[PDB]
Amino acid sequence: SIKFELIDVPIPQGTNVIIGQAHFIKTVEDLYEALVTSVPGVKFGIAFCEASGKRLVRHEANDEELRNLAIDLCKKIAAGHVFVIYIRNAWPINVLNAIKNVPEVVRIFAATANPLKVIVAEVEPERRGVVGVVDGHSPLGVETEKDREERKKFLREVVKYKL
Amino acid sequence: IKFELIDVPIPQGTNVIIGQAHFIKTVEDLYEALVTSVPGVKFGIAFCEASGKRLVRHEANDEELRNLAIDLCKKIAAGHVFVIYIRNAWPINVLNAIKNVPEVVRIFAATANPLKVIVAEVEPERRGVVGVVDGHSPLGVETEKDREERKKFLREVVKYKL
Amino acid sequence: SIKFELIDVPIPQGTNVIIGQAHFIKTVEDLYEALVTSVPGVKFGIAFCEASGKRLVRHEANDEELRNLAIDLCKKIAAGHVFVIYIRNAWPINVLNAIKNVPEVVRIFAATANPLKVIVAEVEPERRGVVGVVDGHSPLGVETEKDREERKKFLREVVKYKL
Amino acid sequence: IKFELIDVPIPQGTNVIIGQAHFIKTVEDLYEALVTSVPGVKFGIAFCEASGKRLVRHEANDEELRNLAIDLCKKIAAGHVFVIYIRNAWPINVLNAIKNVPEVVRIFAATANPLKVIVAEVEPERRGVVGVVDGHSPLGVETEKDREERKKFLREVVKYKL
Amino acid sequence: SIKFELIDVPIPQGTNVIIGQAHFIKTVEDLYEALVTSVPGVKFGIAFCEASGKRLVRHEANDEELRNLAIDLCKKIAAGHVFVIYIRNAWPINVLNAIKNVPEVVRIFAATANPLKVIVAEVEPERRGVVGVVDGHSPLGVETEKDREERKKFLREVVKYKL
Amino acid sequence: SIKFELIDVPIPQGTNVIIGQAHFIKTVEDLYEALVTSVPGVKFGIAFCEASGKRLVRHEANDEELRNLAIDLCKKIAAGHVFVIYIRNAWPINVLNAIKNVPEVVRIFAATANPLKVIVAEVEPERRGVVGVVDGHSPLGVETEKDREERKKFLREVVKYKL
Ligand SMILES: Nc1ncnc2c1ncn2[C@@H]1O[C@H](COP(=O)(O)O)[C@@H](O)[C@H]1O
Ligand SMILES: Nc1ncnc2c1ncn2[C@@H]1O[C@H](COP(=O)(O)O)[C@@H](O)[C@H]1O
Ligand SMILES: Nc1ncnc2c1ncn2[C@@H]1O[C@H](COP(=O)(O)O)[C@@H](O)[C@H]1O
Ligand SMILES: Nc1ncnc2c1ncn2[C@@H]1O[C@H](COP(=O)(O)O)[C@@H](O)[C@H]1O
Ligand SMILES: Nc1ncnc2c1ncn2[C@@H]1O[C@H](COP(=O)(O)O)[C@@H](O)[C@H]1O
Ligand SMILES: Nc1ncnc2c1ncn2[C@@H]1O[C@H](COP(=O)(O)O)[C@@H](O)[C@H]1O
Numbered sequence: 024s025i026k027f028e029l030i031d032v033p034i035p036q037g038t039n040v041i042i043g044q045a046h047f048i049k050t051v052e053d054l055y056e057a058l059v060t061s062v063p064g065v066k067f068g069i070a071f072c073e074a075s076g077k078r079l080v081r082h083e084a085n086d087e088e089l090r091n092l093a094i095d096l097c098k099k100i101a102a103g104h105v106f107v108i109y110i111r112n113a114w115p116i117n118v119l120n121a122i123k124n125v126p127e128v129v130r131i132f133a134a135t136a137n138p139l140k141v142i143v144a145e146v147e148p149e150r151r152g153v154v155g156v157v158d159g160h161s162p163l164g165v166e167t168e169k170d171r172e173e174r175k176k177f178l179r180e181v182v183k184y185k186l
Numbered sequence: 187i188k189f190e191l192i193d194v195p196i197p198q199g200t201n202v203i204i205g206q207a208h209f210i211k212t213v214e215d216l217y218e219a220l221v222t223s224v225p226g227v228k229f230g231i232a233f234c235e236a237s238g239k240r241l242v243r244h245e246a247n248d249e250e251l252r253n254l255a256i257d258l259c260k261k262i263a264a265g266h267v268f269v270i271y272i273r274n275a276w277p278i279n280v281l282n283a284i285k286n287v288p289e290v291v292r293i294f295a296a297t298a299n300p301l302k303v304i305v306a307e308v309e310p311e312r313r314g315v316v317g318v319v320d321g322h323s324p325l326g327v328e329t330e331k332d333r334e335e336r337k338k339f340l341r342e343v344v345k346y347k348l
Numbered sequence: 349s350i351k352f353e354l355i356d357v358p359i360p361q362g363t364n365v366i367i368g369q370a371h372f373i374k375t376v377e378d379l380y381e382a383l384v385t386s387v388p389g390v391k392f393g394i395a396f397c398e399a400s401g402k403r404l405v406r407h408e409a410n411d412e413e414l415r416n417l418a419i420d421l422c423k424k425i426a427a428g429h430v431f432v433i434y435i436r437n438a439w440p441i442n443v444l445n446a447i448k449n450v451p452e453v454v455r456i457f458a459a460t461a462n463p464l465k466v467i468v469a470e471v472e473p474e475r476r477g478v479v480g481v482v483d484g485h486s487p488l489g490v491e492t493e494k495d496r497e498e499r500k501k502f503l504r505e506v507v508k509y510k511l
Numbered sequence: 512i513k514f515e516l517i518d519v520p521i522p523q524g525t526n527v528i529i530g531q532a533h534f535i536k537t538v539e540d541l542y543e544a545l546v547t548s549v550p551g552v553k554f555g556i557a558f559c560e561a562s563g564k565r566l567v568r569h570e571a572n573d574e575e576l577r578n579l580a581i582d583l584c585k586k587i588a589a590g591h592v593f594v595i596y597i598r599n600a601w602p603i604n605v606l607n608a609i610k611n612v613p614e615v616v617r618i619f620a621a622t623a624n625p626l627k628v629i630v631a632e633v634e635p636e637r638r639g640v641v642g643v644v645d646g647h648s649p650l651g652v653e654t655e656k657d658r659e660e661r662k663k664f665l666r667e668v669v670k671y672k673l
Numbered sequence: 674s675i676k677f678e679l680i681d682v683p684i685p686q687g688t689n690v691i692i693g694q695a696h697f698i699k700t701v702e703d704l705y706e707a708l709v710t711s712v713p714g715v716k717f718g719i720a721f722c723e724a725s726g727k728r729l730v731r732h733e734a735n736d737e738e739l740r741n742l743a744i745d746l747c748k749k750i751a752a753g754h755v756f757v758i759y760i761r762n763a764w765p766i767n768v769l770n771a772i773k774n775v776p777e778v779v780r781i782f783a784a785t786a787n788p789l790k791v792i793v794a795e796v797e798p799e800r801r802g803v804v805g806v807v808d809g810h811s812p813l814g815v816e817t818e819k820d821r822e823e824r825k826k827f828l829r830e831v832v833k834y835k836l
Numbered sequence: 837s838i839k840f841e842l843i844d845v846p847i848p849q850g851t852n853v854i855i856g857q858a859h860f861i862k863t864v865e866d867l868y869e870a871l872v873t874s875v876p877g878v879k880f881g882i883a884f885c886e887a888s889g890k891r892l893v894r895h896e897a898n899d900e901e902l903r904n905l906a907i908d909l910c911k912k913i914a915a916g917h918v919f920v921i922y923i924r925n926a927w928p929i930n931v932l933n934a935i936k937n938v939p940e941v942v943r944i945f946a947a948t949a950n951p952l953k954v955i956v957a958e959v960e961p962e963r964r965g966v967v968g969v970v971d972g973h974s975p976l977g978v979e980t981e982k983d984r985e986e987r988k989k990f991l992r993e994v995v996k997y998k999l
Contacts, residue, residue: 024352025352025354025467027187029187029308044458044483046440046458046459046460046483047439047440047441048499048502048503049441049503049509049510051499052503052510052999055999056997056998059996059997060776060929060930060997061874061875061930062874062875062876062930063875063925063926063927063930064876064877072486072487073487074460074462074483074484074485075462075484075485077488077489077495078484078485078486078487078488078489079487079488079489079490079491079495080487080489080490080491081491081496081499082490082491083999085996094490097487098487098490101486101487102482102483102486103462103482103483103484103485103486104458104460104462104483104484112876113875113876114209114876115208115209115288116209116211116288116289116873117288117873117874117875117876119288119289119291120286120288120933120934121933123285123286123448124445124448124774126440126441126442126444126445126710127441127444129444129456129457129458129459130292130455130456130457131291131292132291132292133206133208133266133291134208134291135208135236135266137208137236137237137265137266138237138312140308140312140314142187142306142308142314142316144467144479144480144482146354146465146467146482149485149486150463150465150482150485150486151482151486152465152467152480152481152482152483153480154306154316154467154479154480155306155314155315155316155317155479155480156314157264157265157306157308157309157312157313157314158206158208158236158264158265158266158314159236159237159240159265159266160236160237160240160265160311160312161234161240161263161264161265161311161312161313162234162235162236162240162241162242162259162260162263162265163239163240163241164240164241164242165241165242165244165256165260166235166239166241166242166243166244170239170241170243171243171244174210174243175214175673177210178210178211178214183872183898184211184869184872184873185211185214185672185673185869186662186672186865186868186869186896189349189350191349191350191471214673217673218671218672218673221670221671222603222604222671222939223548223549223604224548224549224550224604225549225599225600225601225604245673247670274550275550276372276550277371277372277451278372278374278451278452278547279451279547279548279549279550281451281452281454282449282451282607282608283607285448285449286937288873292455293454293455294369294454294455295369295371295429295454296371296454297371297399297429299371299399299400299428299429302471302475302477304350304469304471304477304479316469316479316480317469317477317478317479317480318477319427319428319469319471319475319476319477320369320371320399320427320428320429320477321399321400321403321428321429322399322400322403322428322474322475323397323403323426323427323428323474323475323476324397324398324403324404324405324422324423324426325402325403325404326403326404326405327404327405327407327419327423328398328402328404328405328406328407332402332404332406333406336373336376336406337377337836339373340373340374340377345546345572346374346543346546346547347374347377347543347835347836348539348542348543348570348825348835377836380836381834381835381836384833384834385613385766385767385834386711386712386767387711387712387713387763387767388712388714388762388763388764388767389714408836410833437713438713439713441710442710442711442712442713445770445771446770449611451547500999508709508735509706509709509710510706510998510999511702511705511733511988511998512677512679512792514837514838516837516838516959531783531808533765533783533784533785533787533808534764534765534766535824535827535828536766536828536834536835539825539828539835559811559812560812560816561785561787561808561809561810561812562787562788562809562810564813564816564820565809565810565811565812565813565814566812566813566814566815566816566820567812567814567815567816568816568820568821568824569815569816569821581815584812585812585815588811588812589807589808589811590787590807590808590809590810590811590812591783591785591787591808591809601860602859602860602939603860603862603939603940604939606939606940606942607937607939610773610936610937611770611773613765613766613767613769613770614766614769616769616781616782616783616784617780617781617782617943618942618943619857619942619943620857620859620917620942621859621942622859622887622917624859624887624888624916624917627959627963627965629838629957629959629965629967631792631804631805631807633679633790633792633807634807636810636811637788637790637807637810637811638807638811639790639792639805639806639807639808640805641792641804641805641957641967641968642805642957642965642966642967642968643965644915644916644957644959644963644964644965645857645859645887645915645916645917645965646887646888646891646916646917647887647888647891647916647962647963648885648891648914648915648916648962648963648964649885649886649891649892649893649910649911649914650890650891650892651891651892651893652892652893652895652907652911653886653890653892653893653894653895657890657892657894658894661861661864661894662865664861665861665862665865671862672862672865674840675840675842675955694946694971696928696946696947696948696971697927697928697929698987698990698991699929699991699997699998701987702991702998722974722975723975724948724950724971724972724973725950725972725973727976727977727983728972728973728974728975728976728977729975729976729977729978729979729983730975730977730978730979731979731984731987732978732979744978747975748975748978751974751975752970752971752974753950753970753971753972753973753974754946754948754950754971754972773936774933774936776928776929776930776932776933777929777932779932779944779945779946779947780943780944780945794955794967794968794970796842796953796955796970799973799974800951800953800970800973800974801970801974802953802955802968802969802970802971803968804955804967804968805967805968
């Protein structure tokens, strides 16, 4: 029938993870390029589950810890055509549109540094796919106007992403 | 793992857009995407902050739509989900702008059809969207006559095609 | 309550399939145009599940084989606002970014020529949605340096997509 | 090489967008870009076919704007130039859609300011656009007070920013 | 002061030319990739005027005639950071959005198979820039409604780009 | 009638400049955001020639040197709706696609760190437009196979933008 499995995603402090689905072996080189040409100091590991042929986890990196995190999560999800990116010295918003526009990339499941689970379906031996993710925690309530003011201030005075 | 079905209310004249993003700036960037797309668009946006205070963050120029968006976020109750309700605009008027907001990771639905969201709860307070049910299944396959009728609809009625 | 079903996706040799979610009847015409204006000589079929009103599988094609493959998969998936595209004489990378930018298109579940299953949830009679896909097979191992050299060679000497 | 200046009329309530494209499908694709961007947009589009019959090709849902666009194409008289006049929409509502039309190669201007097009004629019937003059040169540099005033304009008046 | 020069662009039957401006040496590889990954049968030459360093016309191609056309036009325009693409077996609409989205690419001056001139300004020795182009001929008149019907028919029955 | 002027563009070592055309006052804020959200630690100045009303050079920056460079160039070009961006700690390729997709931006004339001139037409007092630019220098020759190997090596071993 269908077996659901939960995969916990380790996210060390200072990293962000991006998980998606693509196709074709060139994914690995195109994602390498999207990352290194987006932010000069970026440190990353990228791994991609080739789904046919030799069926290898394909990987590039300029940081060995991040390479191994990416590889290990691909091994655990173990679903054809999934890719995993771990990054330091850059935020997902710095690279996401580049990633969306890689022609091999078909969808992105998560971009986050929160506690994160991946929900995987195994339908037959060695046939697995991503069902969804659980990105952080459910809401505790609704923000107030003063909470709104606070987050506006955060964006303007702290991270300076807005004026 | 438990699955839950969330019914999505869609008042006449509105459309809903449901997706997933990350980072608090989501709500400001989605506000701008909408307001700069269509003059006179009316909307409510709500976004599930998934860490820290874990507050539903919201922007709107219509209070009915604000509160619909907030309600649905609370019902779905999945981290980093956003909901947009719109009036005086169609999803096609705004969707490419939304896709290109850097915080936005994925869109699950854009529609006015009867709609359900399928949510997985894996543990208390840890939920995610596993799909949507957008309207109903097919009743059959269109004929050449049906084709001619939808071609005329797009050219004579809504005038989106020549 | 919720029933999960598995739909097998036929893929004749020489074809690729792209499956996604959209909305609005204009989907069919816009995807037609996206395909035909991308690659001279592309052969395709496109079907879309209109999810209200007449609830007809809507379709366009320049190849009858591919039309019927697209229509048949839509009948089997049977989920509102899902679209299916079968292509010959073009690869998904040749058309995907065009498809992504169609304003009706909201998400793409798969683009592939691998063995492929679609996981569909039926929540009540006539109410179905796509939960995920199973694209090819789980990984057999992790790429070695030697395997990386072979992948690089393939991209440079065989398909000539990299220099 | 001779240079000519073409004055561009801009009626109150309109904006003009001038660029360069190629291939007859330009006009249909620009029509669709506009009509699917903003409900109730009013427009005229004209495009200079630069071979074959060399006819100005045009689409519109407003006759005043159609004819303005046609007139300007004739005055510029440069192969593969297009002109769009719009009402009930702003250029920012439609420009990204226009940029992404595959026939469109470049955009010279989007504005309601007084505007001139600079055209080079190299030989009879062989002309091209060499630039535009969009409004007037700067009178000075804004102060912090001026800054605060434009920030308030964008947040309190047009509400494009928070 | 400023010297204006007119460069005539040869366009052999069955080719199209794309002329633009970019920056950075990676332009040449990224444009190669944009072209070869857009249309399977595409034949092309691409040349780019490196504007500093060794200041070479940089080039890639899978067709030697087109390579030489591209190189020769770069030599004649002789303006820093200009690029030239000649293509067969594909139309500009098949590749243009990919080209626009190459991060090195800053503008496109022309995409056409019409009689074409490039207007170049030389301001000082070996300092040249593109002022504009003359793409085909000035209009002879305004199309009628029946002319409109004819071009609609062309798009629907002949090239089949619209329905 | 028409006077042509040549504006020299100062480019301190470590900076790049991007010059373009936009419209509407929101240009300044949207370009600010495009820059700051692209690369952590980017330093920039952005100036824009408001072309009606008060006709003020509008500006935003996180670095006073770069602000004044941007403002000064706008004063010298002195053409309505032109924008200038100077950046440190980021390359144009890191930000260009974001800039291209700002809805106010209509065209980009240059992105470079080379010697650069802007050609401005003055058609009457206070009425100026950008005609073109002269980005670096004319080519000295055509790339040999040996030169191509060196270019490839540079991209793979030095800047690591290609594999
Ligand atoms: N300054 C920032 N810039 C860009 N993205 C951020 C920033 N801070 C947090 N994020 C992203 O937004 C998510 C939620 O924010 P946080 O409140 O830090 O848990 C993080 O997991 C990051 O993926
Ligand atoms: N005129 C229109 N323009 C754009 N989108 C539309 C229009 N009419 C319907 N839609 C969208 O397409 C979906 C299906 O349409 P309907 O067949 O009218 O139920 C709706 O729920 C809307 O999201
Ligand atoms: N030469 C190619 N160009 C583009 N896409 C390809 C190519 N070869 C394979 N693919 C795609 O990548 C997927 C996996 O490749 P394969 O290893 O050939 O089974 C296929 O299912 C195709 O969708
Ligand atoms: N069937 C076509 N598909 C795509 N582009 C075309 C086609 N025919 C012509 N073009 C382009 O449109 C331009 C003008 O068309 P023509 O009427 O063939 O001179 C040509 O120079 C080509 O660049
Ligand atoms: N509210 C607005 N929304 C979008 N664009 C605008 C708006 N107001 C003015 N513009 C554009 O910006 C240009 C400069 O504005 P103004 O200062 O009002 O002359 C105009 O010619 C319009 O093209
Ligand atoms: N490492 C790099 N990454 C990105 N862009 C660069 C890099 N090096 C040079 N550039 C850009 O390409 C242009 C020409 O390069 P150069 O050969 O270094 O003078 C410069 O003016 C920069 O704008």
